């Protein structure tokens, strides 16, 4: 018999390359559009007594 010769050792992974950057994450808009209005009307009351 002979002894097994040294095995090929594994290699450490290269490591994930990361791009740095700035981000803005947008979501679907569910808020209603809001604005200001003015109602002009007249309450008309006819009372039969």
């Amino acid at each position: 018999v002979q002894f097994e010769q040294p095995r090929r050792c594994p290699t450490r992974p290269e490591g994930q390359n990361y791009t740095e950057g700035i981000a803005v994450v947008f979501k679907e808009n569910i808020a209603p559009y809001k604005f200001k209005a003015t109602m002009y009307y007249k309450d008309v009351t006819v009372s039969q007594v």
């Binding site: 979501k27 569910i30 808020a31 209603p32």
Partner: protein
């Protein structure tokens, strides 16, 4: 003559193993829509 151990070339019989601890991480609260946003998405509020 006389030498210190720093004056002798040093070879290592040790196999290196560099283990580092997984760091602490903080999870902030995060919501896509708040319950106020969900309430406000209705066109007409009956109560108001």
């Amino acid at each position: 003559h006389q030498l210190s151990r720093a004056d002798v070339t040093t070879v290592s019989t040790f196999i290196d193993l560099n283990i580092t601890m997984l760091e602490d991480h903080e999870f902030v609260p995060l919501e896509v829509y708040t319950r106020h946003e969900i309430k406000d998405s209705g066109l007409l509020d009956y109560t108001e």
